[PDB]
Amino acid sequence: GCPXDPWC
């Protein structure tokens, strides 16, 4: 889920 993850 995003945003939150390292890719967000």
Instruction: Report which residue type is found at 1.
Output: G
Q: How many CA atoms lie within 13 A of 7 on its CB side?
A: 2
Residue with tokens 């967000």: 8
The CA distance from 3 to 5, in Å, is 6
Q: How many CA atoms lie within 13 A of 2 on its CB side?
A: 4
The CA distance from 4 to 1, in Å, is 7
Experimental determination approach used: NMR
Both structure tokens of 6: 């390292």
How many residues appear in the chain?
8
SS3 assignment for 1-8: CCCCCCCC
Cα 5 to chain center, whole Å? 3
Cα 6 to chain center, whole Å? 5
Both structure tokens of 3: 């945003």
